[PDB]
Design an enzyme around this catalytic site. Sequence first.
Site, PDB file in Angstrom:
ATOM      1  N   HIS B  95       1.002  -1.537   0.155  1.00 11.43           N
ATOM      2  CA  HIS B  95       0.210  -0.265  -0.040  1.00 11.43           C
ATOM      3  C   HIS B  95       0.913   1.492  -0.013  1.00 11.43           C
ATOM      4  O   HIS B  95       0.542   2.891  -0.342  1.00 11.43           O
ATOM      5  CB  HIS B  95      -1.207  -0.233   0.774  1.00 11.43           C
ATOM      6  CG  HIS B  95      -2.288  -0.755   1.169  1.00 11.43           C
ATOM      7  ND1 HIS B  95      -3.198  -1.167   1.774  1.00 11.43           N
ATOM      8  CD2 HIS B  95      -1.978  -2.149   0.336  1.00 11.43           C
ATOM      9  CE1 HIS B  95      -3.933  -2.387   0.901  1.00 11.43           C
ATOM     10  NE2 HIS B  95      -3.554  -2.559   0.145  1.00 11.43           N
ATOM     11  N   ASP B  96       2.193   0.982   0.036  1.00 10.89           N
ATOM     12  CA  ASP B  96       3.300   2.148  -0.110  1.00 10.89           C
ATOM     13  C   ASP B  96       3.938   2.401  -1.478  1.00 10.89           C
ATOM     14  O   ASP B  96       3.784   2.867  -1.809  1.00 10.89           O
ATOM     15  CB  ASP B  96       4.522   2.070   0.646  1.00 10.89           C
ATOM     16  CG  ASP B  96       5.543   3.352   1.490  1.00 10.89           C
ATOM     17  OD1 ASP B  96       5.199   4.136   1.113  1.00 10.89           O
ATOM     18  OD2 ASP B  96       6.368   3.249   2.348  1.00 10.89           O
TER      19      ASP B  96
HETATM   20  N1  LIG Z   1      -6.349  -2.860  -5.505  1.00 11.57           N
HETATM   21  C1  LIG Z   1      -6.561  -3.205  -5.075  1.00 11.57           C
HETATM   22  C2  LIG Z   1      -8.113  -2.948  -4.560  1.00 11.57           C
HETATM   23  C3  LIG Z   1      -8.617  -3.238  -2.796  1.00 11.57           C
HETATM   24  C4  LIG Z   1      -9.957  -3.287  -2.898  1.00 11.57           C
HETATM   25  C5  LIG Z   1      -9.932  -1.725  -1.799  1.00 11.57           C
HETATM   26  C6  LIG Z   1     -10.477  -0.544  -3.187  1.00 11.57           C
HETATM   27  C7  LIG Z   1     -10.231   0.617  -2.630  1.00 11.57           C
HETATM   28  C8  LIG Z   1     -10.595   1.155  -1.273  1.00 11.57           C
HETATM   29  C9  LIG Z   1     -10.644  -0.695   0.113  1.00 11.57           C
HETATM   30  C10 LIG Z   1     -10.442  -1.993  -0.729  1.00 11.57           C
HETATM   31  C11 LIG Z   1      -7.093  -3.788  -2.029  1.00 11.57           C
HETATM   32  N2  LIG Z   1      -7.013  -4.255  -0.706  1.00 11.57           N
HETATM   33  N3  LIG Z   1      -6.043  -4.781  -0.092  1.00 11.57           N
HETATM   34  N4  LIG Z   1      -5.493  -4.488  -1.705  1.00 11.57           N
HETATM   35  C12 LIG Z   1      -6.121  -3.851  -2.425  1.00 11.57           C
HETATM   36  N5  LIG Z   1      -5.087  -3.360  -3.766  1.00 11.57           N
HETATM   37 CA   LIG Z   2       5.722   5.144  -1.727  1.00 12.13          CA
END
Ligand SMILES: Nc1cc(Cc2ccccc2)c2[nH]nnc2n1
Ligand SMILES: [Ca+2]
Lengths: 465, 103
Positions: B95-96
Amino acid sequence: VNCETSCVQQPPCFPLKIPPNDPRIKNQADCIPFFRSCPACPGSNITIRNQINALTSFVDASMVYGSEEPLARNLRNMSNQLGLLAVNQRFQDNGRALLPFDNLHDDPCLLTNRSARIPCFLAGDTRSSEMPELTSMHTLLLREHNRLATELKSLNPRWDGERLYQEARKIVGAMVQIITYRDYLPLVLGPTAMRKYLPTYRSYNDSVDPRIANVFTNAFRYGHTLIQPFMFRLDNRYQPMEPNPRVPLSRVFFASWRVVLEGGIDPILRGLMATPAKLNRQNQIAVDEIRERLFEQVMRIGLDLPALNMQRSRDHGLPGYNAWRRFCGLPQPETVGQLGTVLRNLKLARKLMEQYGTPNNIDIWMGGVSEPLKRKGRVGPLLACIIGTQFRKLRDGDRFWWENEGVFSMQQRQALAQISLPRIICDNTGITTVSKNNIFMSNSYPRDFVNCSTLPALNLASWRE
Amino acid sequence: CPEQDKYRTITGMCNNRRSPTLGASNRAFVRWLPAEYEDGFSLPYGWTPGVKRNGFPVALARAVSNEIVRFPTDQLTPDQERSLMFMQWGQLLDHDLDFTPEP
Ligand SMILES: Nc1cc(Cc2ccccc2)c2[nH]nnc2n1
Ligand SMILES: [Ca+2]
Ligand code: HEC
Ligand SMILES: [Cl-]
Ligand SMILES: [Cl-]
């Protein structure tokens, strides 16, 4: 047209069609929904379709701070010159901070509980509320920036908001990099792949492309095979926290209420620390909490994560298994027997062949998660290559990499070398007993746990002006 | 590009001074291999029924999931060498690095 409701394959829809004798969806006229990722070049008949990265590729803790300037601005506490990150004003977790809420149009967190009325949290990345365990880590980090911007204010009281924030952001960003490269990656890759792909850091190289590669967005989904079917909560004694100590996953997705109301982040962190991860095995790849009941509460149908990963790789035009093995300089199996040898398992090889016909068509995630695990690592040779190569690029091609000359003084770096995830937990929660290093290996209480007293804290003396 | 900076931009712009968008948000991914599309440029394999890949029909992702991935929850092996924090760090780390937007 509307991807969340229709089964019509019309741009941007690419619905996952249902096969015969599906163990969950009997109507083959139904589908698992899927929106194709936004094209880099919209509607071009010229240029080859590529996707976009909404984030900074750097291990810069953009999940805490944001990757777009207005978001970054909004995540900050603009009420004073303390250089703090905005905290929830409606709630706290035992007098400690929680992330502030987001103002979504169609909010999926509210859908998990009408009574509670707890919406999605606002953080650098928009997926923060996806699961309370991820939310715990985002909250852990929101507290570390504020704790550092407090120690730096008491050390340099002449410093303003911008300075304190930028100086704290810089430390969080370095902690993220240290944990990842010193603790996380060696345990993903194993020792050999670690030497091969991540030899000792020399210096910053401005010719190293730091971009995330399309394949990595799929290869890095190997973690979906480490997912446990429940969220575990444990009290200060590391014993189950009843009621609902093992809450199934399909009931926790977007359940931001469980953080605010069901005990805060501490029972969740203890759970992460003292519970073993699921082990990826050839006949035990990924759990039904994600393969059948992913986002079950909030969608019209349960999604299938492994299948979504395979549809996503096809949408991203990713070459098959053998093209990636070739790219890695690894032998490419042509026959069922040859795939058997690579897999050390002819049964799995026969199944994969029945599905794909050729090892040339095996989807990246599928063929990657199927390979036997490297010694002291949690991936096989193909993923180790893709993972390792990508991380070396983010390291060797980061001008702001913690070890780069001019980023931190020799003194600031000797101080930063002392950091750990168990210590960050100590400093920002009510948790007093943390994992023995390595936090990623340590999964048994009381065998792998020690007190916060033993642990060295980070010394900010070298940050004094 | 500012001649002398002490901190990163939020966006990642200016990290590489020669190619300033490199690693910066809201840009195309880099490809390590040429894309493999049905039409060659945009359509995914499996988008068109009967259209084969390398002379073999395209398996349904849901079917591969059913045949290969599906296993009974009871069989789960806990990793004696890893914590759930190991899984969790992976997601927070991911997520980073990347988020592929959709419409
Ligand atoms: N492209 C993704 C999508 C989602 C789903 C989601 C999308 C928007 C907001 C919250 C959750 C993921 N959840 N964890 N990695 C992710 N990578
Ligand atoms: Ca980054
Ligand atoms: C070790 C890493 C890792 C872990 C752990 C992990 N994911 Fe993923 N996940 C990824 C990556 C990479 C992507 C691609 C993200 C992107 O580029 O948009 C992703 C994508 C997804 C997607 C998008 C599916 C699609 O293709 O349309 C879903 C849904 C998802 N993950 C859910 C989860 C959930 C739910 C959890 C935990 C409950 C989780 N992930 C844990 C790495 C991981
Ligand atoms: Cl708020
Ligand atoms: Cl790629």
